[PDB]
Every structure is written in C-alpha cells, then in structure tokens.
Amino acid sequence: DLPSSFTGYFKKFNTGEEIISQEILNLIELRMRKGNIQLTNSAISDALKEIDSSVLNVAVTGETGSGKSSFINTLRGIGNEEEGAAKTGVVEVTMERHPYKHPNIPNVVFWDLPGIGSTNFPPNTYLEKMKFYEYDFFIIISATRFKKNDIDIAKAISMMKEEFYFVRTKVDSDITNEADGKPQTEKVLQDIRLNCVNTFRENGIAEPPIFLLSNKNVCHYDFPVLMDELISDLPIYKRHNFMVSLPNITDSVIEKKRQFLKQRIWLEGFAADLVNIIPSLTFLLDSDLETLKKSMKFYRTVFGVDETSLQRLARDWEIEVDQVEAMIKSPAVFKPTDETIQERLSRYIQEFCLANGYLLPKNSFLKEIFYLKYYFLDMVTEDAKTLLKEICLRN
Template sequence: MGQLLSDTSNNEDNGDLVSSATKYFMEIKAETKIISQETIHLIEFHLKKGNIQGANSVINDALKNIDNAPINVAVTGESGAGKSSFINALRGVEPEDQDAAEEGVTETTMMRTPYKHPKIKTLTLWDLPGIGTMNFPPKDYLEKVKFQEYDFFIIVSATRFTKLELDLAKAIIFMKKNYYFVRTKVDNDLQNEKKSKPRTFDGEKTLQQIRSYCVNTFTQNNMDEPQIFLISNRHLSDYDFPILMDTLIKDLPNQKRHNFMLSLPNITEAAIDRKHKIMQQYIWLEAFKDGLLATVPVVGMIRDDVEKLKEKLNHYRVLFGVDDESLQVMAKDSQVPVEQLRKITKSPYLLETKKEETLGELFLKYLEKFASASGGPLALGLYFRKTFYLQFIFLDTVTEDAKVLLRVTYSKN
C-alpha cells in the first residue's frame, strides 16, 4: 500500500482528493445517503486542510455508528390483522421456522415481544399487544410499551382502522415519533371480490375502494389523510410494500438506513439494486478511509488479505441471499432443484483460481474491466488497495446472482 498523504495543507493532491470526495457524495441521492451532510462537510473540511488522519477519524466513527446503530420497529394492530406474518415477511422468515412469530393465533399477551432479524443483528421488530387488548388510553399505552425505544410505529389493520388506532396515531405524533398505516390482506379482498363479481371484477377499482374506505375513517374522525399502504404479506412485490420500504428508508436517520436496507427481502430487481448502491457506499467509505491515494501494486496478496476477502465474499452472499443456506430455502419454496440454482450463480467461484493463477493475477484480470465501468473509484481518480477493488467485484457479482435467482424462482411461483 502506498504512503498516505502527510498532514499538510500545502499538499498539491488535496484539491483532487476533495473534489473526488465531493463528486462522489453529490451523486448520491439525499434520501439514500448513509452518512449525514454534516459528516460529509466535516470530511471535506479535513481534506481541504490536508488533515488525512482527521478525515479518516471522521469516516471511521461514521462506519462504527452505521454498524452499531440499533433499529427498533414497533408493529401494532388488532388481533388477526396480520401483525405476525408482517413481521415474519420483514425478517425473511417462514411461518414454520423455529424463531418465527406465531401466526393465526388469538392475541392474549399483554407484553411486547421482540424478534431479531436473522441477518442484521442490530434490527429488532417488536410485536406489540393491540391497543384494544389493553384497557389504557393511547398515551398510557405508549408508555407501557416503552414508546421511546422505537424508531417508528407501524399500525396494521385487515379491515378499517379503529378509533382507538387513530387516537394512538395522534398520541404517537404528540410523542414526536413517526407512524405508518398498513392495510394488510388486500390479496384476499381481491380474490373475494373476483369470486363474487367474476364478470365485472376490476382489480384497480377494488384497491381504490379499499383505500377510500380507509381514508373515510380519518375524515370522519377529523384527521388529515395519511399515506396508507395496501399490502399482501404473501406477495411482497405486489401492491404498496415496495413503496412502504422506500418511505421507511427515506425517513430513517442516515446511519440507520444501511442495515435496514440490507435487511429487506429481494422482492424486485429494483430492491436488489438499492441494496447494491447502499453497500457500495459502505465499501467506498472503508476504502477511502484505509487507502487514500494509495497506489495499486501488482505484487501478490498476503495470506491475511486472502482470508479477509473470503470472509467479505461470504458476508455479501449472506446479505444478498445467495449463500448456500438461502439457496436451500429458495429451492424448497420455488421447487427448483438446489443444484440448478447453484449452477446459475457465479459468486461462490470468484476466489477459485487455477493452480498457475495467483489471486493477484486474478485481480489484474478484473481491474481493466472494472476501471472502464462508469461510477467506479478509478473514474474518480482514486486508487485503493486491491482488496477493495475485489470487494466491488464481489458486490457486483452477488447483486447479479440475486437478480438471476429472483427471475428463476419468480417464474416458478
């Protein structure tokens, strides 16, 4: 690795470094940035002064905040509204899995129940008792369920929202928290409507009627019309679930967006692309911190680098749902042989090299292609350690694997 810049404001490379960082951050949409604008300004400030260690320290602290920031999501609603299946869907867990939220049972608990995300350890979804099951006013209810611990509330209903739930929303606003109304089981409503009116059935019209029915509840209770998300817990790519996820990501603090985005299921290619972009930010920040203006030597890699690369590749495969365990689940759900799914993925074989080919040579083989791609670090005039270039290649490959698997399994459903 080449020498980092010395702490001097006279270094002639500082201008290029600042402009490169500024250009990169400017190209990222504000609602998807994983570090705040204040943090970006602070990084640029240190770089302008030639204080590389200061810039590194700011980035390092930002990455730690991203890794460690807890995300707590509260889900409430009446019994039978689909709270548990909604929580399982967000966690990518099947109803029969050991740690799944129990579905289809009458709510009797007066306690909140936490469910950790299986891949993102900082994310917890809380199943709250329905406000109707607790004989408390909304404000007291929020205090009982420890409202201050949650990033936002999701209020779930399978019919129309009750006055208790509307009053709860008012109390949440008073407590200065965000809330979202989710109307579940719209697929059931559409099926029932189609059965009862097979000749005149109009799916879009039915969905609009469901939405209007919900909105009237707010109008009748003298409340402003909120955004209402119509979803099916069984068919996440349909209806408003993708819009709900986009809204939650946009409303979360910067440092919590990264892990929340990575926790979401691969329901569409657009969702996979968003994961790719947000993960690219994280890798870029790591590379910028550890390899500012480092040259790219052509010598081989040390054993520690190889082991770390293997860990990174496996980590990305897990996050994008293309690891062996995920393939087994996918094969079962889609009834596609797991061997067939393995054959169409490329990421498991990225670090397999021929006997005469070193990992360093493999890197050089990919570098030319990577350098010509728009938006890569080389396009910014920056040079990172070769391990980071390979991480970008890993990310591109697992992203493409996830898309290919989505196409194959979706066509079987």
C-alpha cells in the same frame, strides 16, 4: 485533487440514496484539505461507526389476526415456519412486548406490540409500560378498517412528533373473494382505501395515506412504496442498516442496496490510507483473503443469494441448489477449483480496472481488497436480478 474527488462520488448517487449527510461529507472534505491524515481517517471511521452502530427499533401495534406477525417475518425475509421468526398465525397474548432482531442485521429489531385492546391497563399506562420512546417509528397494521383503538394510538403518536404508518394487510384475500366467479370486468383497492379513511374521517381529522398490501405477495401493490417511504422519513445515517435488511422484491431495491454498499466501500477505502501502488500485483494475504470471505458472505446474505437462501429455489421447482447455483456467479467464487484463488482474484481485479478505471486521480489507488469488493458487489447484484426472474415466474 483528492478532496475534490472524494466529494464527487457521493454526487453520482441520488439525494435519497445518500449513506451519509452532506453535513458530514463537508466535514470530511475539510479535514482532508488540512492534510492531517490522523483526524481525517478518524472522522471517516466515526461515520462508519455511526452507521454500523446505528440501531433501529420498530414498534408494531395492531388488532389480532391482521398479518402483523407475518409482516415481521416478511421484512426479515424469514418464513412463517422457522423458530427464530415471529409466530405467524398464533398470537402471543402476553400483554408483554417481544423483540425480533434481523437474522443478518442484528441492529434491526422489530417489536410486535399487543393491541391496546386486551391490555389490562388504562391507555395512559399502556403507552408508558410500552416504552415507545425507544422506537424510531411506528407501524400500524389492520386486517380490515382501522378502529378507534388504532386511531387513538395514531393520534398520540402524531402528537409526540414521531412518524407512524398505516398498513392494511391481506388485501389479496379481499380481491380474490370479491372477484370470485365474476366476469373479467383495480376497484377493490380503491374501495378499501376509502373504507379506511371513512372510519378515520369519522373521528380523526386529516386521514393519513394508507398502504394496501399482502404479506403473501411482497412484490406487488403498495409494499414497495411503503419501504421507500419508511427510509425517506428515517435519518440519513440510519438508512444504511435498514436498507440492506429489506426484502429483495425489485431490481430498483436491489440496485439501491448496491448503491448504498458502494458508498460504504468508498468510505471504508478512504478510511484506509490510500496508496500509489496499482492492485493486481503479486499475491494476496490470508488475512485479506479471510476479510473478503466475510465481506462476500455478507453481500450474499443481504441480496438473498447466500447458501441459506439458496435452499428456497430448490422448493420452487424442486431443483437442487447446485442447479440453482449455476445460474448465478456468487457461490462459484470460493469453490476449490484448478482454475487457486490467488490467481482467480488476480483475474477479477484486472477486468474491473480496465472497464472502470481506478476511480481515483492518477497515481492514487484504493487498497486491492476494496476493488474486489466493488466487483463482488456488482456480481452479487446481477445475481440477485437473475435469481429474481426465476422467482417471479413461480407462485
């Protein structure tokens, strides 16, 4: 039956890839069996509302000149040259916090916090004037080893039953400087991980795990692990909003993004009344057409394959966007061509259903718009991996 099926699509994903908890999924299944379409749709819409309305506030504290402002621009996927991005080299020194919303996901805000050092208030008033209660978790950055200042902040955070994370930036510079001129014969990474703990263990018991990374190289070292760790500690419903905002550094992250978005499509489709009508018949409406345009540009912006991000492969090899656009099939979706869109989308739907079935029990179907979303999602995901390969060979 339908209740059985909706429950199961959630099962093909991993336990850490759940867009919604098992507590609510069983609540939706229960309502569905009741037969009251009103309450069922409402519960699903509420779940979607909870996810979409979910706000994440990340507080970042750290000594000057470590890479925390560049760390803000890194996760946001923004260069250190833009005006909307955090000032990457220069430091504010306002004793005043400044928020930074994600360019694509406004519900994601990063806070650059003044180091306790150079604050003009006793740490008792430091934390209060900060308003740290509002944040979901803390990120602690240090360019070298973590000093007492940073450590004392950590202890307070741990004491308040909140999560914190130590981030050691500029690891690339250490390896380069230490290795420079020496023979070919990952020792630097091991020395730094101990050095951070050596200062920790001196005053602070039970040194926590520390992540060594480089804001200039998001794809290597412990950068991937940190993102994975942050999501797991976050509440189930909060993972969705944060996940899509993360940098597309690997195929795993890209695929993970696809998986979450796939579940949201499933949810959205179910929130809408199901039908007995097979898609790919007659023509689509302008309203549903515009909704696909908004959904498409949303998927493209998340996987960094949007026209704005298409500006940044043009600089990698000095190659115009058109040339970059040819590799991927994303931009060539809403392009005015002789081959109408009403006849083009009619083609996408047929290929998808023949290869993947209708995803639902016989005689039951999702609205046409939802099947197109799965197709686009798959298309953009594949494009992200294709674009990724070209990116990795350079720089």
